Nucleic acid binder design. Structure first.
Ligand SMILES: [Cl-]
Ligand SMILES: [Cl-]
Ligand SMILES: [Cl-]
Ligand SMILES: [Cl-]
Ligand SMILES: [Mn+2]
Ligand SMILES: [Mn+2]
Ligand SMILES: [Mn+2]
Ligand SMILES: [Mn+2]
Ligand SMILES: [Mn+2]
Ligand SMILES: [Mn+2]
Ligand SMILES: [Mn+2]
Ligand SMILES: [Mn+2]
Ligand SMILES: [Mn+2]
Ligand SMILES: [Mn+2]
Ligand SMILES: [Mn+2]
Ligand SMILES: [Mn+2]
Lengths: 84, 94, 108, 99, 97, 78, 91, 104
DNA sequence: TCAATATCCACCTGCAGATTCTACCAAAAGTGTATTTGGAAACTGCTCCATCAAAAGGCATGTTCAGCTGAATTCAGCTGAACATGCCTTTTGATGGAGCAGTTTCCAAATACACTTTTGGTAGAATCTGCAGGTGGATATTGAT
DNA sequence: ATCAATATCCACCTGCAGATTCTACCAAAAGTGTATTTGGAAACTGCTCCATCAAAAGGCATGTTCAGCTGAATTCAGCTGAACATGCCTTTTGATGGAGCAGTTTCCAAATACACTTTTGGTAGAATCTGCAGGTGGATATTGA
């Protein structure tokens, strides 16, 4: 299996623009895209860290949707729809 | 193998009561189950806390009721308290 | 033995009183659980799901669909002040957002 | 002419469209890779249930979308219409996130 | 006579108050305000003195915090004067509005 | 009574918050926020009072109210 | 009567600062602190055990809880301190 | 011969055990859980006291008061993060004036 | 730069309210003694998580090109800051009670246990039907004149 | 105001996924009878929480002046929005291993359960002492000149 690098750039300019649109943003500065990637990175890392912590506590090698749900819930970011 | 419990069945009955004509996609039922589980935990949690703050070892409908008042906003609380009280007095009336 | 009557019917409810009672005992909420606690809890739960299904169903109708989907649940929640507060820190997968554009952004 | 919409017209057209729909706006495979890369840096040999990756995407997109609304409010507050990094920072600061 | 320029005394107070910890709201007026609001939830209530103090502490720490976010919002709009739109913006982002 | 919370007191609070210049409309605005805050906390507290079947609001009632409103206070019993 | 962590906080105070004392108001702050952290850790351990369908909270649950609640460095040392107390106790 | 002394702690192990049992957290509690939990509670306590002690010493005072606990916490990245949604009564705020507000 | 106003910064000073400190008792906390039982091993059954193949076409990447937006610059009308000036509450104490949180102790009512009976609810299957995805024209909206 | 370009609606279709409904079984929820508290009685008892003055200072409420801050208006150098050409790589669809999650079944090492048996943490009055709050006195910092 190949090495994983620079995947944060997979979060393209077009995709960030779409998200801002849904968020009601009309005009976007050129520097928004890198800040966004940075912000998303931190968000993901924190949720993945807690999620993976639940996985390991359960002696599993597979991250389950529940792991993510509990990770989100404890970060005050409760998610409906994968609870089962 | 093994069975997984859920409120789907009940959510579905209530749905038919308010919207006879209407159905619901499984994704939407999935969200309804998360909602029921969430509020249940929020209420039991606050109830458990209430009982513990008052050195009481049992959670009675009285705890569930204060929890509801502390959890739900305005009208929602009032209506829920009404249905809650109604079910209990009806339940106890044999 | 005697005519088996569910606590739900005895309570005049659709939601499962027995199930809810069990969940309380096995949730480590308290040493003991009163008989009226699950009855009152099942009723509040049933009332709340009736309230959001009522509104979701209307949202569905407005979009000319007969089947409630997540987006209809979002509209019902976000458009009702109280439910919105109650679920103010909850995210509904596949629900999107409410159409809302700040005035200053519209063509002069 | 050739016909040409004025700047801002298509942007508003896009806002109405995306606020109307609920599908995910980030591409799937790329997002999946980002998750596996980040996970891998925390712990090796990890595998994911497909719904776990979808739960993460649903969460990140709701989060970014909500952050852009606050960001948009911060820009408007500065008598602007263009969101800038400084706006996103003001929002996360007031939100109590990184502060 | 002798006058300090606008803002000079303002900065002086910021330094004094950011350095002290005493409650900045007159005690009596506060207690008076608390009982009035409480009276609407249940009549003839008695209040533990420590209960009133906890409220004033929470309340003052809350306003001070809110004033910091408000100041930031005003600085953002390139102003130095806080205004209702500033308190309003901050409460919205915080999810209070 | 809300008027009891005076301009000069609001000024001090703002000062501890690092505010240098204050618009005249801030005072009434601040009072409204102050009132909403106290109403929310006190309501939750008195609800803990009434549940404990007491007639006296205790610091713990307040501390518990604060905790559930996301405003945890240290120094009064928790 | 009413029990607090006061006595213990004070003992610990003397170890880090023999020469330093502590006002009662500040002692109140420390009690609130100990109580709060206790609830947070106990609460998370409670959930961890429930998610994993267990009826008992072991040092293993308290450890994951600490790992999920404390920021980076604080977590490490806390974890160090904890396993250190448990090993020494087991002997 | 107490468990705290056996664990080599100054924090009440027996009490942490009793509190865990009576708090409705789980049906049963391991023997090491209260030991661990108590060690963790002690360590954070020493950490705060250490810094608040330094805060007092820097104020040329020998008795730690609330102000000192506030300066120790807010000036520490991690403790600040941990107690981010907590307010220390009578602790005030960190001296801090936005640059733009400075004169001339 | 100079002269002076009002602001800090200091090393001392000394009660005083708030701290260490004293000297006894119950409600834990630590001990032996069974009594239980939760939940690591040990296996397997059998989901469902990686990987791969192959084929498009949706959608990302780069460029042009110039509309109009973010940012300087100005400028002056007011809004807030700084300041005496009085004067009205907030503050600070000591009652003096009266309201009331806390026990005591008591049992009738309300759980928790135990041990079978009696079905409502959960897989899968079989059966049923909204509506996603396409199309082709009615409006509808924009932007050049 | 007028076109014409281009972007929406708005029904009208119909087979699929996906819902619904149909069946077969247990895992639970229901009965019953038997111990076990739970915690809501009514009677009292020391806090400690108001209501009462007092008397002051403080600290707040009022104008006065005018410094300098916030908009309003104007200008313009690009930045960032459309539109278009290219063709990359995410999507879609199966087809397979097996990696590894769940089930079922053992039992011990590790918790409850329980009466005792000390012990420690609390509480109510002894002896102190860390600083708050004041003080002349000495540079500062801020301003008008
Ligand atoms: Cl009950
Ligand atoms: Cl910026
Ligand atoms: Cl305003
Ligand atoms: Cl353990
Ligand atoms: Mn209806
Ligand atoms: Mn077993
Ligand atoms: Mn140009
Ligand atoms: Mn502009
Ligand atoms: Mn002027
Ligand atoms: Mn009485
Ligand atoms: Mn049946
Ligand atoms: Mn369609
Ligand atoms: Mn290309
Ligand atoms: Mn295998
Ligand atoms: Mn002792
Ligand atoms: Mn001093």
């Amino acid at each position: 299996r190949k090495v994983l690098r620079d995947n944060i750039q997979g979060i393209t300019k077009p995709a960030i623009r779409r998200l801002a649109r849904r968020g009601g943003v009309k005009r976007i500065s050129g520097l928004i895209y890198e800040e966004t990637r940075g912000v998303l990175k931190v968000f993901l890392e924190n949720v993945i860290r807690d999620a993976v912590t639940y996985t390991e506590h359960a002696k599993r090698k597979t991250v389950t949707a529940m792991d993510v749900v509990y990770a989100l819930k404890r970060q005050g970011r409760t998610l409906y729809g994968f609870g089962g | 193998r093994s069975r997984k419990e859920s409120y789907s069945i009940y959510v579905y009955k209530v749905l038919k009561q308010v919207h006879p004509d209407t159905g619901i996609s499984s994704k939407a039922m999935g969200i309804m189950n998360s909602f029921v589980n969430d509020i249940f935990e929020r209420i039991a949690g606050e109830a458990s806390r209430l009982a513990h703050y008052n050195k009481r070892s049992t959670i009675t409908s009285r705890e569930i009721q204060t929890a509801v008042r502390l959890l739900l906003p305005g009208e929602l609380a009032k209506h829920a308290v009404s249905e809650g009280t109604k079910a209990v007095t009806k339940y106890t009336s044999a | 033995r005697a005519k088996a009557k569910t606590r739900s019917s005895r309570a005049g409810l659709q939601f499962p009183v027995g199930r809810v009672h069990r969940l309380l005992r096995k949730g480590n909420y308290s040493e003991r659980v009163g008989a009226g606690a699950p009855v009152y809890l099942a009723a509040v739960l049933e009332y709340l799901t009736a309230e959001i299904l009522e509104l979701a169903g209307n949202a569905a109708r407005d979009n000319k669909k007969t089947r409630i989907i997540p987006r209809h649940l979002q509209l019902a929640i976000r458009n009702d002040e109280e439910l919105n507060k109650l679920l103010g820190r909850v995210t509904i997968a596949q629900g999107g957002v409410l159409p809302n554009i700040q005035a200053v952004l519209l063509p002069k | 002419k050739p016909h040409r919409y004025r700047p801002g017209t298509v942007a508003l057209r896009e806002i109405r469209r995306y606020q109307k729909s609920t599908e995910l706006l980030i591409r799937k495979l790329p997002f999946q890779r980002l998750v596996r890369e980040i996970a891998q840096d925390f712990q090796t040999d990890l595998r994911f249930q497909s719904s776990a990756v979808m739960a993460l995407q649903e969460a990140c997109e709701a989060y970014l979308v909500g952050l852009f609304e606050d960001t948009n409010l911060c820009a408007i507050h500065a008598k602007r219409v263009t969101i800038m990094p400084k706006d996103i920072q003001l929002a996360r600061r007031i939100r109590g996130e990184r502060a």
